[PDB]
Enzyme design. Structure first.
Site, PDB file in Angstrom:
ATOM      1  N   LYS A 115     -14.514  -6.882  -9.909  1.00 39.95           N
ATOM      2  CA  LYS A 115     -13.602  -7.686 -10.716  1.00 39.95           C
ATOM      3  C   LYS A 115     -12.981  -8.764  -9.799  1.00 39.95           C
ATOM      4  O   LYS A 115     -12.699  -9.868 -10.255  1.00 39.95           O
ATOM      5  CB  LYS A 115     -12.544  -6.826 -11.432  1.00 39.95           C
ATOM      6  CG  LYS A 115     -11.368  -7.586 -12.116  1.00 39.95           C
ATOM      7  CD  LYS A 115     -10.627  -6.712 -13.134  1.00 39.95           C
ATOM      8  CE  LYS A 115      -9.161  -7.163 -13.403  1.00 39.95           C
ATOM      9  NZ  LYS A 115      -8.291  -7.208 -12.151  1.00 39.95           N
ATOM     10  N   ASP A 116     -12.876  -8.485  -8.494  1.00 38.00           N
ATOM     11  CA  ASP A 116     -12.358  -9.476  -7.530  1.00 38.00           C
ATOM     12  C   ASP A 116     -13.424 -10.535  -7.163  1.00 38.00           C
ATOM     13  O   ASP A 116     -13.102 -11.698  -6.869  1.00 38.00           O
ATOM     14  CB  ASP A 116     -11.876  -8.801  -6.255  1.00 38.00           C
ATOM     15  CG  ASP A 116     -10.417  -8.434  -6.298  1.00 38.00           C
ATOM     16  OD1 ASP A 116      -9.841  -8.398  -7.420  1.00 38.00           O
ATOM     17  OD2 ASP A 116      -9.782  -8.116  -5.241  1.00 38.00           O
TER      18      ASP A 116
ATOM     19  N   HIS B 275       0.765  -1.236   0.000  1.00 41.16           N
ATOM     20  CA  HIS B 275       0.000   0.000   0.000  1.00 41.16           C
ATOM     21  C   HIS B 275       0.797   1.289   0.000  1.00 41.16           C
ATOM     22  O   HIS B 275       0.245   2.349  -0.312  1.00 41.16           O
ATOM     23  CB  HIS B 275      -1.136  -0.010   1.030  1.00 41.16           C
ATOM     24  CG  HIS B 275      -2.283  -0.910   0.643  1.00 41.16           C
ATOM     25  ND1 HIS B 275      -3.042  -1.606   1.568  1.00 41.16           N
ATOM     26  CD2 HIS B 275      -2.788  -1.233  -0.574  1.00 41.16           C
ATOM     27  CE1 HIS B 275      -3.962  -2.315   0.935  1.00 41.16           C
ATOM     28  NE2 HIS B 275      -3.834  -2.103  -0.364  1.00 41.16           N
TER      29      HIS B 275
ATOM     30  N   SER C 171      -0.540  -0.474  -6.612  1.00 46.80           N
ATOM     31  CA  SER C 171      -0.233  -1.566  -7.507  1.00 46.80           C
ATOM     32  C   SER C 171       0.610  -1.131  -8.731  1.00 46.80           C
ATOM     33  O   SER C 171       0.575   0.038  -9.122  1.00 46.80           O
ATOM     34  CB  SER C 171      -1.543  -2.207  -7.990  1.00 46.80           C
ATOM     35  OG  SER C 171      -2.149  -2.973  -6.962  1.00 46.80           O
TER      36      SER C 171
ATOM     37  N   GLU D 196       4.287 -34.083  -3.606  1.00 47.97           N
ATOM     38  CA  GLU D 196       3.068 -33.559  -4.236  1.00 47.97           C
ATOM     39  C   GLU D 196       3.407 -32.734  -5.497  1.00 47.97           C
ATOM     40  O   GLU D 196       4.481 -32.114  -5.574  1.00 47.97           O
ATOM     41  CB  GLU D 196       2.285 -32.722  -3.244  1.00 47.97           C
ATOM     42  CG  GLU D 196       1.404 -33.527  -2.327  1.00 47.97           C
ATOM     43  CD  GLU D 196       0.157 -34.012  -3.032  1.00 47.97           C
ATOM     44  OE1 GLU D 196      -0.103 -35.238  -3.043  1.00 47.97           O
ATOM     45  OE2 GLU D 196      -0.573 -33.166  -3.584  1.00 47.97           O
TER      46      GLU D 196
HETATM   47  C1  HEM Z   1       0.529 -15.824   1.107  1.00 43.03           C
HETATM   48  C2  HEM Z   1       0.412 -15.710  -0.412  1.00 43.03           C
HETATM   49  C3  HEM Z   1       0.285 -14.286  -0.898  1.00 43.03           C
HETATM   50  C4  HEM Z   1      -0.740 -13.469  -0.685  1.00 43.03           C
HETATM   51  C5  HEM Z   1      -1.984 -13.752   0.126  1.00 43.03           C
HETATM   52  C6  HEM Z   1      -0.494 -12.325  -1.298  1.00 43.03           C
HETATM   53  C7  HEM Z   1      -1.482 -11.240  -1.272  1.00 43.03           C
HETATM   54  C8  HEM Z   1      -1.262 -10.216  -2.337  1.00 43.03           C
HETATM   55  C9  HEM Z   1      -2.336  -9.252  -2.626  1.00 43.03           C
HETATM   56  C10 HEM Z   1      -3.701  -9.217  -2.000  1.00 43.03           C
HETATM   57  C11 HEM Z   1      -1.822  -8.366  -3.664  1.00 43.03           C
HETATM   58  C12 HEM Z   1      -2.645  -7.255  -4.248  1.00 43.03           C
HETATM   59  C13 HEM Z   1      -2.352  -6.895  -5.703  1.00 43.03           C
HETATM   60  C14 HEM Z   1      -2.210  -8.064  -6.652  1.00 43.03           C
HETATM   61  O1  HEM Z   1      -2.600  -9.169  -6.372  1.00 43.03           O
HETATM   62  O2  HEM Z   1      -1.634  -7.901  -7.703  1.00 43.03           O
HETATM   63  C15 HEM Z   1      -0.435  -8.835  -3.924  1.00 43.03           C
HETATM   64  C16 HEM Z   1       0.460  -8.185  -4.924  1.00 43.03           C
HETATM   65  C17 HEM Z   1       1.907  -8.560  -4.900  1.00 43.03           C
HETATM   66  N1  HEM Z   1       2.483  -9.671  -4.247  1.00 43.03           N
HETATM   67 FE1  HEM Z   1       1.606 -11.023  -3.121  1.00 43.03          FE
HETATM   68  N2  HEM Z   1       0.714 -12.401  -2.028  1.00 43.03           N
HETATM   69  C18 HEM Z   1       1.182 -13.677  -1.665  1.00 43.03           C
HETATM   70  C19 HEM Z   1       2.414 -14.355  -2.115  1.00 43.03           C
HETATM   71  C20 HEM Z   1       3.342 -13.453  -2.858  1.00 43.03           C
HETATM   72  C21 HEM Z   1       4.447 -13.935  -3.407  1.00 43.03           C
HETATM   73  C22 HEM Z   1       4.801 -15.414  -3.358  1.00 43.03           C
HETATM   74  C23 HEM Z   1       5.125 -12.922  -3.955  1.00 43.03           C
HETATM   75  C24 HEM Z   1       6.419 -12.976  -4.744  1.00 43.03           C
HETATM   76  C25 HEM Z   1       7.550 -13.666  -4.004  1.00 43.03           C
HETATM   77  C26 HEM Z   1       4.428 -11.809  -3.782  1.00 43.03           C
HETATM   78  C27 HEM Z   1       4.954 -10.477  -4.202  1.00 43.03           C
HETATM   79  C28 HEM Z   1       3.840  -9.564  -4.585  1.00 43.03           C
HETATM   80  C29 HEM Z   1       4.037  -8.461  -5.296  1.00 43.03           C
HETATM   81  C30 HEM Z   1       5.409  -8.019  -5.770  1.00 43.03           C
HETATM   82  C31 HEM Z   1       2.871  -7.839  -5.500  1.00 43.03           C
HETATM   83  C32 HEM Z   1       2.678  -6.528  -6.269  1.00 43.03           C
HETATM   84  C33 HEM Z   1       1.924  -6.827  -7.560  1.00 43.03           C
HETATM   85  C34 HEM Z   1       1.747  -5.680  -8.527  1.00 43.03           C
HETATM   86  O3  HEM Z   1       1.347  -4.597  -8.126  1.00 43.03           O
HETATM   87  O4  HEM Z   1       1.916  -5.869  -9.726  1.00 43.03           O
HETATM   88  N3  HEM Z   1       3.289 -12.046  -2.975  1.00 43.03           N
HETATM   89  N4  HEM Z   1      -0.215  -9.913  -3.129  1.00 43.03           N
END
Ligand code: HEM
Ligand code: HEM
Ligand code: HEM
Lengths: 60, 67, 241, 378, 75, 96
Positions: D226-227, D200, D204, D270
Site C-alpha cells: 500500500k506504501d 513505534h 499507529s 512561495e
Molecule cells: C519531516 C516530515 C515528517 C516525516 C518524514 C514524518 C514521517 C512519519 C511517518 C513515516 C509516519 C508513519 C505513520 C503515518 O504516516 O501515519 C508518521 C506518523 C505521524 N506523524 Fe509524522 N512525519 C513528518 C512531519 C510530521 C508532522 C509535521 C507532524 C505533526 C506536527 C507529524 C506528527 C505525526 C504523527 C502524530 C503521526 C502519527 C500518525 C497516526 O498514527 O495516525 N509528523 N510520520
C-alpha cells in the site's frame, strides 16, 4: 491454448525465482527497445516539426 | 504594399457587437474629455475594454492563416 | 497607470501538451533576434553551438558566429585582439556596462531575451501581444515621445519603439514578413531561449503517461491481490453458553 | 533461529517495517508519512546533484543555475524535480498535519511535537533553499522575511544584521544559506528517525480512533505494498509538474537576476507560506504581525491541550467535522488572500480569516467537543 | 515495545480466510464499487462541502469587488 | 589592513590616495579614475599575466602576498635570496 499459456508460462519460467528473474531482465531488454520505438514513433506522428527539416537544408 | 493578416483580421473583429459598444463608450468618453478643459478623468479604461474584446477574438482567428 | 489589460491566448504550435516546437519558426525567430534586438537586447545564455541540434547545421552555425569580432584571450604582450567567433561563443552583445543601455536610450534597460518568455507572466502571449498590439494614445495623457504608448504594458506607458513592422527579412525558402508573422517567430524563438529542453521533456512526459498508464493499474492489482486475504476475511464470534 | 529477527541491524529494519504490528484499519491518509520520507531522500538526492554544479557566489549564483539547465546533462529534470519536490514535500506535509488533527493522532505528545519540529525545520530549510538561485524573488523574499526578526525588542536589529553578515542581504547572506540548506536536511532526517522511534512506542492510530490491538496486521506485505502504490502516485504528481508544468507553482519574477534597488510591486513568498503571510499583514503592527505569524504555526503545539472530546477521532463527531473543514477552507482563504495585493476587499477579508483561524482552533473546536460530549450523555 | 503475541487478549473469535491465488482481486469492482462511493459521498457532503462553497462565494465576490473598485464614474 | 598594524587611519588614507584606481561605471557605461580609498587593495604592475612576461623575458615575479609562506624556509629564504646575491663561479654562463 489459453489456460495452458499462463500455465506453461508459470511451468517453464515462473517457479524458480531464477528463471523468474532471468525472464524479467531479458523481458526488460526487448521491452525497453520496443517501447522506445513506438513511443518516439508516436511523438513524431503527432509532430513532424523537426528532422524532415534535414532533408532540406543539407544533404552534402 | 504588404499583406497584413493582423489588419485584415482586426477590421472584421474590430467590427463586432462587443467592440462597437466599447468603442462607442470610448468615443463617448473621448468627446466628453475633449469638450472639457481642466479635467483629469482621462479616458484610459475605455480603450482597454475595447482591446480585450477585440484582441480575444483576434487570437481565435489569427494564426489559422498565418504561414 | 495602475490599471492593466491581460494577453489573449494565441494558439501557439507548442501550447499543446505533447506539442513540439516549430523549428522552422525558431530560425525565422533567430534571424529576428540577430538584426533587430541584438543591438539593444542581451542574450547572454544562448551560444552558437546551442543552435546546432535545433535549427541550423554544424557548418551553418559556424559561419553565423564568424560574422562578428569577439575578443579572445591575452597573448604574450598581455594584450587583447579580436577573433572571427567560434561556436563556444555566446551572444553577449549591445553595451558593456548596464548604464550604457541607459545612456544610449534614456534610462530604460532593454532586458535580456534569454529568459523573457519565462520571466514576465503570460509567456510568448505577453511578448507577442506587446510586440503586435502597439497602439495610439487615447486622451488625457501625453507621454514624452520617448516613453511610447503600449496597452499591453504596465502603466501602459513605456520606453521601447515598435521595430516590428520596420521589416528586414531572410527566409531561405521564403515567407512574407508582416508585423504579425515576424512576431510569432521572435516569440517562438524566445520560448526556446528560455527553455531549450521544451521538446525533450514532453517526449518523456508522453512516456511518463504511457508508463504510468501501465504501472499504476499493475501495482494496484498487486496490492489488490495481497489485501485479498483481508478483504474477504469472514469473522464469527462464538462465546460460551 | 531467524536472522532477520536477531541480527543487530536487521532487527531495526524488521521491527520498523516488516513485522511491526499495524492496524488493518489505516487508510490513504496514512500514506503521507512514507511519502514525506520519499520527499526527503528525493530532495537530498537531486539536491546533491544540483550542488555538484551550482556555485554559491552572487557573481555565478544565477549563472550556475542556468548552466545546470542548459549545459549540464539532464540538469534540467534534476533542477525541476528539486523545485517541484519541494512543493510535493509541502503538500504531503500539510496533508500529514491534516490527518493528525482530524484523527486525534496528536494524543501522541512526543511523536507530534517532533513533527512540529519537523515542520519548522523543513520550513526553515525551504526558505533558505529558494534564496539560492539569487533571483529577484530570492533576494527580495529573502529580504522581506529575514527582517521580520527586527521587531524583537532591543535585539531585532543586532540579530538581523548578525544573520545577514552585514547591513543587507549580501554575499555573506548567500553562501550562508547554501551551507545551512545543505546541513538542515541531514538533521531533518535524524529528527525524523526519533519521530519514528517515538511513534513505534504506541504503533499507529487509526480512522476510528479506537484502539486496534485487537486487530493488528504485519506491516509487510500490506503496508509495504500500500506504501509502494502511493509512492508511484507521488511520482505521477511530481513528474506531471516537472514534465508538463514546471513553472506553474513558481514565480516568473525569480527568473530575473536579483537587483537590490529594484523592488518588484508583486512581492510574495512561495505558495506554501501564503496562508502565514496573509495572517502576518492582516495586523497593522510590526511586533503584532510577527508575533501572530509565529503563533500561527507554533499553535500546532497547543492542539493536544485543547482536546476536549471523549473520543479521539473526529470520525464519529459531526460538529467537529464541520469545524475541521471550515479550518481547511479558512486556510484556503488565507492562501488566496496572501497571494493578493494589500488593498480593497482583501484587507478586511484577510483580517477576518485570521481571527477565524484562531477562533476555530483556540475556541470553536474545543467547544464543539464539549457539546458533542454533552449530546452523548458523556 | 510492540510485537505480535503481546498486544492484547482476545477470545472466542474465529476468522475464515482465503488464499489470494484462489480469489479475484477485483470482485464486483463497479457492481458494488460505485454504489459504495456514492454512499460515502452522501455520508460526508453536508460536512465537507458547505465550508468550501462558503470560500468559493467569498472568493468570486471578493474578486469582483476588487476589480470593480478600481474604476470611477462621476466625482 | 595597514591601519591597526603600522600607520594611523589618516596616514593610511593618504598612502592610498597617491595612485589612480578605476572606480565603477557611471551613466555612460564608462570607467574613470579615482584617488584611492582604503577599500582598495594593492593590485598593481601588469594586467594580463603575460604582460609580466613581455616586460621581463618570460619570468613571472610572483605575488608577495603569500611568498613567505609559499617557498620553504620563510623569511629566511627570501632574505637570503635578497642578500646572498653573488657572482658566477665557473663553467656556466647565464644569458645576462
Ligand atoms: C519531516 C516530515 C515528517 C516525516 C518524514 C514524518 C514521517 C512519519 C511517518 C513515516 C509516519 C508513519 C505513520 C503515518 O504516516 O501515519 C508518521 C506518523 C505521524 N506523524 Fe509524522 N512525519 C513528518 C512531519 C510530521 C508532522 C509535521 C507532524 C505533526 C506536527 C507529524 C506528527 C505525526 C504523527 C502524530 C503521526 C502519527 C500518525 C497516526 O498514527 O495516525 N509528523 N510520520
Ligand atoms: C524583435 C526585437 C525586440 C524584441 C523582441 C523586444 C522585446 C522586448 C521585451 C519583451 C521587453 C520587456 C517588456 C516588459 O518589460 O514587459 C523589451 C524592453 C525594451 N526594449 Fe525591446 N525588443 C526588441 C528590439 C528593441 C529595440 C530595437 C529597442 C530599441 C528601440 C529596444 C529597446 C527596449 C527598451 C528600451 C525596453 C525597455 C522598456 C521599458 O522598460 O521602458 N528593444 N523589449
Ligand atoms: C541536503 C540536500 C539538499 C541539497 C544538497 C540542496 C542543494 C540545493 C541547491 C544547490 C539549490 C540551488 C540550485 C537550484 O535552485 O536548482 C537548491 C534549490 C532549492 N531546494 Fe534544495 N537542497 C537540499 C535539500 C532540500 C530540501 C530538504 C528542500 C526542502 C523541500 C529543498 C527545497 C529547495 C528549494 C525550495 C530550492 C530553491 C528553489 C529552486 O529550485 O529554484 N532542497 N537546493
Amino acid at each position: 491454448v489459453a489456460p495452458t499459456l499462463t500455465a506453461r508460462l508459470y511451468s517453464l519460467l515462473f517457479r524458480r525465482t531464477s528463471t523468474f528473474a532471468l525472464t524479467i531482465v531479458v523481458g526488460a531488454l526487448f521491452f525497453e527497445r520496443a517501447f522506445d520505438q513506438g513511443a518516439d514513433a508516436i511523438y513524431e506522428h503527432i509532430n513532424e516539426g523537426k528532422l524532415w527539416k534535414h532533408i532540406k537544408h543539407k544533404y552534402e | 504594399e504588404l499583406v497584413d493578416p493582423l489588419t485584415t483580421v482586426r477590421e472584421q473583429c474590430e467590427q463586432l457587437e462587443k467592440c462597437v459598444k466599447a468603442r462607442e463608450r470610448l468615443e463617448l468618453c473621448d468627446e466628453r474629455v475633449s469638450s472639457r478643459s481642466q479635467t483629469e478623468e482621462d479616458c484610459t479604461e475605455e480603450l482597454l475594454d475595447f482591446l480585450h474584446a477585440r484582441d480575444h477574438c483576434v487570437a481565435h482567428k489569427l494564426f489559422n492563416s498565418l504561414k | 497607470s495602475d490599471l492593466e489589460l491581460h494577453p489573449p491566448s494565441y494558439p501557439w504550435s507548442h501550447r499543446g501538451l505533447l506539442s513540439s516546437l516549430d523549428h522552422t519558426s525558431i530560425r525565422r525567430g533567430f534571424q529576428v533576434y540577430k538584426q533587430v534586438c541584438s543591438s539593444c537586447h542581451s542574450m547572454d545564455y544562448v551560444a552558437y553551438r546551442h543552435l546546432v541540434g535545433v535549427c541550423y547545421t554544424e557548418d551553418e552555425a559556424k559561419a553565423l558566429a564568424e560574422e562578428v569580432e569577439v575578443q579572445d584571450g591575452p597573448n604574450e604582450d598581455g594584450e587583447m585582439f579580436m577573433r572571427p567567433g567560434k561556436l563556444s561563443d555566446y551572444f553577449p552583445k549591445p553595451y558593456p556596462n548596464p548604464e550604457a543601455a541607459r545612456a544610449a536610450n534614456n534610462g530604460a534597460l532593454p532586458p535580456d531575451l534569454s529568459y523573457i518568455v519565462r520571466a514576465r507572466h503570460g509567456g510568448e502571449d505577453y511578448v507577442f501581444s506587446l510586440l503586435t498590439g502597439y497602439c495610439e494614445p487615447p486622451t488625457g495623457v501625453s507621454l514624452r515621445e520617448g516613453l511610447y504608448f503600449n496597452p499591453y504594458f504596465p502603466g501602459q506607458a513605456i520606453g521601447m519603439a515598435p521595430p516590428i513592422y520596420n521589416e528586414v527579412l531572410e527566409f531561405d525558402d521564403g515567407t512574407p514578413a508582416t508585423m504579425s508573422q515576424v512576431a510569432k517567430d521572435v516569440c517562438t524563438f524566445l520560448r526556446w531561449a528560455a527553455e531549450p529542453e521544451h521538446d525533450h521533456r514532453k517526449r518523456m512526459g508522453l512516456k511518463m503517461l504511457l508508463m504510468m498508464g501501465l504501472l499504476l493499474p499493475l501495482v494496484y492489482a498487486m496490492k489488490r491481490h495481497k489485501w485479498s486475504v483481508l478483504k474477504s476475511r469472514k469473522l464469527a464470534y462464538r462465546p460460551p453458553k | 533461529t531467524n536472522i532477520r529477527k536477531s541480527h543487530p541491524l536487521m532487527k531495526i529494519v524488521n521491527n520498523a517495517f516488516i513485522d511491526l504490528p499495524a492496524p488493518s484499519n489505516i487508510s490513504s491518509w496514512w500514506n503521507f508519512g512514507s511519502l514525506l520520507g520519499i520527499c526527503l531522500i528525493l530532495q537530498i538526492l537531486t539536491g546533491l546533484f544540483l550542488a555538484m554544479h551550482y556555485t554559491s557566489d552572487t557573481t555565478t549564483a544565477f549563472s550556475s543555475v542556468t548552466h545546470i539547465c542548459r549545459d549540464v546533462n539532464y540538469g534540467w529534470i534534476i533542477r525541476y524535480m528539486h523545485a517541484n519536490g519541494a512543493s510535493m514535500f509541502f503538500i504531503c506535509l500539510y496533508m500529514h498535519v491534516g490527518r493528525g488533527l482530524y484523527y486525534g493522532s496528536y494524543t501522541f505528545l512526543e511523536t507530534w511535537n517532533i513533527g512540529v519540529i519537523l515542520l519548522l525545520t523543513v520550513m526553515a530549510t525551504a526558505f533558505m533553499g529558494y534564496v539560492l538561485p539569487w533571483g529577484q524573488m530570492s533576494f527580495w523574499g529573502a529580504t522581506v522575511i529575514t527582517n521580520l526578526l527586527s521587531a524583537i525588542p532591543y535585539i531585532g536589529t543586532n540579530l538581523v544584521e548578525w544573520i545577514w553578515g552585514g547591513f543587507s542581504v549580501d554575499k555573506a547572506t548567500l553562501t550562508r544559506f547554501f551551507a545551512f540548506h545543505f546541513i538542515l536536511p541531514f538533521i531533518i532526517m535524524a529528527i525524523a528517525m526519533v519521530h519514528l522511534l517515538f511513534l513505534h512506542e504506541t504503533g499507529s492510530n487509526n480512522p476510528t480512533g479506537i484502539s486496534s490491538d485487537v486487530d493488528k496486521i504485519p506491516f509487510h506485505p500490506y503496508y509495504t505494498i500500500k506504501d509502494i502504490l502511493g509512492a508511484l502516485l507521488l511520482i505521477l504528481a511530481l513528474m506531471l509538474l516537472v514534465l508538463f508544468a514546471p513553472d506553474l507553482l513558481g514565480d516568473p519574477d525569480n527568473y530575473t537576476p536579483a537587483n537590490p534597488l529594484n523592488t518588484p510591486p508583486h512581492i510574495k513568498p512561495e505558495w506554501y507560506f501564503l496562508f502565514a503571510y496573509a495572517i502576518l499583514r492582516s495586523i497593522p503592527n510590526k511586533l503584532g504581525g510577527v508575533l501572530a505569524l509565529a503563533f500561527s504555526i507554533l499553535i500546532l503545539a497547543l492542539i493536544p491541550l485543547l482536546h476536549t472530546s471523549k473520543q479521539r477521532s473526529m470520525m464519529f463527531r459531526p460538529l467537529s467535522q464541520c469545524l475541521f473543514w471550515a479550518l481547511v477552507a479558512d486556510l484556503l482563504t488565507l492562501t488566496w488572500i496572501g497571494g493578493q495585493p494589500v488593498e480593497h476587499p482583501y484587507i478586511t477579508i484577510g483580517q477576518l480569516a485570521s481571527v477565524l483561524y484562531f477562533l476555530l482552533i483556540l475556541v470553536l473546536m474545543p467547544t464543539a467537543g464539549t457539546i458533542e460530549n454533552k449530546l452523548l450523555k458523556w | 515495545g510492540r510485537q505480535f503475541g503481546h498486544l492484547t487478549r482476545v477470545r472466542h473469535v474465529i476468522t475464515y480466510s482465503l488464499s489470494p491465488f484462489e480469489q479475484r482481486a477485483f470482485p464486483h469492482y463497479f457492481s458494488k464499487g460505485i454504489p459504495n462511493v456514492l454512499r460515502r459521498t452522501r455520508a460526508c457532503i453536508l460536512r465537507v462541502a458547505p465550508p468550501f462553497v462558503a470560500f468559493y462565494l467569498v472568493y468570486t465576490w471578493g474578486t469582483q469587488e476588487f476589480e470593480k473598485s478600481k474604476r470611477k464614474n462621476p466625482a
